Design a protein around this ligand. Structure first.
Ligand code: XM8
Ligand code: ZN
Ligand code: ZN
Length: 232
């Protein structure tokens, strides 16, 4: 009923959208992994009379439900998708997207890692993102590679029309008391990568984490704090 939807409010298999700004939504889904249930976020950005999708809804059936929810709530076709790193909450569902006519994209680093892990593999490679600090335009967004953080390949996404920063899994929500799933992370480099985000996007008004509630720029400093303390 208008609040940001939380893990126990979304049954696994259902998707909800949340309006972030004019022409910007997040998508929220839930998934079971190793016997626990987690929420995760992605982004939808209006691209004229088409939509750009950022990240799957964490699984094939969730991603089919995402496409149905978009049709119900927005009614414009999803034509392109970008996955912001190689984990299943970002690429799981790419095969569903690819069969629904969506062109799927990721960095070459993400594509390699997805392939090596046995995860679904986006079709198209995004060049120009291999060195930290790199940025490229992709429709109505800018894609930015901040350096290694949650994963070596993680990308963040900025919507300049709305000053929306989608941090993906390199950014944690304010209530986080832990650095999440760090199996593929670089805890030593993560603060430096967050500092790069802070320097590059000082006018961000909304910051969206990969999991949990959006907020403001404080999510960036909070993330650095939880990562340093996790390492400590
Ligand atoms: C799909 C992804 O696969 C990762 C993976 C890696 C390696 C292997 C081995 N090949 C297998 C799987 C995955 C699965 C399950 C949970 C997560 C979480 C997660 C997010 C927030 C919290 C709350 S908190 C207060 O700590 O911030 C917590 Cl506990 C966890 C994240 C995330 O941090 O991005 N990613 C997750
Ligand atoms: Zn991840
Ligand atoms: Zn994640």
């Amino acid at each position: 009923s208008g609040e940001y939807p939380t893990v126990n409010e979304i049954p696994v298999g259902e998707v909800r959208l949340y309006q972030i700004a004019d022409g910007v939504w997040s998508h929220i889904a839930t998934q079971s992994f190793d016997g626990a249930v987690y929420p995760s976020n992605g982004l939808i950005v209006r691209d004229g009379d088409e939509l750009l999708l950022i990240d799957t809804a964490w699984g094939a059936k969730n991603t089919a439900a995402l496409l149905a929810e978009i049709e119900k709530q927005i009614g414009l076709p999803v034509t392109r998708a970008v996955s912001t790193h190689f984990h299943d909450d970002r690429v799981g569902g790419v095969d569903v997207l690819r069969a629904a006519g969506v062109a799927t994209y990721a960095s070459p680093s993400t594509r390699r890692l997805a392939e090596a892990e046995g995860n679904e593999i986006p079709t198209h490679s995004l060049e120009g993102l291999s060195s930290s600090g790199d940025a490229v335009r992709f429709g109505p967004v800018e894609l930015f590679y901040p350096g290694a953080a949650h994963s070596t390949d993680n990308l963040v996404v900025y919507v300049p029309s709305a000053n929306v920063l989608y941090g993906g899994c390199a950014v944690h929500e304010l209530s986080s008391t832990s650095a999440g799933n760090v199996a593929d992370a670089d805890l030593a480099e993560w603060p430096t990568s967050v500092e790069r985000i802070q320097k590059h996007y000082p006018e961000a008004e909304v910051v969206i984490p990969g999991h949990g509630l959006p907020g403001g720029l404080d999510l960036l400093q909070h993330t650095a704090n939880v990562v340093k303390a996790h390492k400590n």
